[PDB]
């Protein structure tokens, strides 16, 4: 079943949500041409582990390699920082993050355009975060989870570019992956109602051609079938009585942290 998080548990969301969203704000300046998708992540760890006195819950999930997922252009998700990956001007990187503290787990990840912008990276992440934006502002008590991932799809298809339908939004609290799954497009299979002291995530992934996308023989990496761009913003959400709260809001986004519904 999907968990009621109490009034202490969302406490301590607040708090490890608010460390996901910090390590996001810490790396920007260091996002630059030249520099390495292996020094990012190094830099991240550090600080979660050295600074914040927290954990990513990425290393050694299910064997994963290094703590945060950085991905580059066609790279849709779970891209492995290499010392040898430099970035470069136009490239498009997602990186996600997610930290634990004091048992809970804070999720979430941000598009950076390195130097100078195409246009194509520019619009397609825009797209992106618009996206998650409008589904952020459906979530209340009440509503079922298809709705939303339905005008996810709606406003994405709109726009010129595709869903991905794999690597849904998740349930999140004690557990990293919880339920329940958090579509980003219209199904007939989706049926949840929402309500109060759910905690999740919402994390679309937008590719500027097609849908499909393949999985590389390093058992990580997953990029565009279609070799077209691809992005992806993501928050940890808990639902309130009137609309929900932002927990792993930065000083960068332009939604406000909690969205009251009357
Ligand atoms: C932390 C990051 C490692 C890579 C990966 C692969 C698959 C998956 O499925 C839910 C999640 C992750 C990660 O979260
Ligand atoms: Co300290
Ligand atoms: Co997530
Ligand atoms: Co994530
Ligand atoms: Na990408």
Redesign the pocket.
């Known amino acids: 079943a999907i968990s009621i998080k109490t009034p202490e548990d969302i406490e301590k969301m607040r708090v490890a949500g608010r460390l996901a969203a910090e390590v996001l704000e810490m790396i920007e300046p260091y996002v630059k041409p030249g520099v390495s998708t292996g020094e990012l992540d190094r830099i991240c760890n550090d600080y979660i582990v050295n600074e914040q006195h927290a954990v ?4 050694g ?2 064997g ?1 390699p ?4 950085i991905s580059i252009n066609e790279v849709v ?2 891209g ?1 920082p290499d010392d040898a990956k430099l970035l470069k001007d136009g490239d498009i990187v997602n990186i ?1 993050v ?1 930290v634990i503290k004091d048992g809970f787990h804070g ?1 979430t990840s941000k598009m950076f355009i390195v130097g100078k912008p195409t246009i194509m990276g520019e619009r397609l992440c825009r797209i992106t975060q618009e996206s998650l934006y409008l589904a952020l502002r459906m979530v209340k008590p009440g509503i079922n989870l298809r709705e939303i991932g339905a005008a996810i799809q709606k406003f994405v298809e709109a726009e010129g570019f595709s869903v991905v339908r794999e ?1 849904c939004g ?1 349930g999140i609290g004690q557990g ?2 919880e339920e329940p799954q958090v579509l980003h497009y219209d199904s007939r299979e989706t049926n949840v109602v929402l309500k109060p002291g759910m905690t999740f995530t919402i994390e679309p992934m937008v590719n500027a051609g097609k849908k499909e996308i393949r999985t590389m023989k390093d058992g ?1 990496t997953v990029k565009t079938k279609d070799r077209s761009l691809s992005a992806q913003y993501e928050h940890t959400i808990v639902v309130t009585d009137n609309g929900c709260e932002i927990l792993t809001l930065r000083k960068d986004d332009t939604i406000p942290a909690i969205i009251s519904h009357d």
């Not at 990513?56 to 290393?59: D, F, G, N, R």
């Not at 290094?66 to 997922?69: E, L, Q, R, T």
Request: net charge negative.
């Open positions: 990513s819950a990425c290393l999930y299910h994963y290094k703590s945060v997922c998700c779970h492995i996600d997610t999720d690597y998740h990293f992956h990580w």
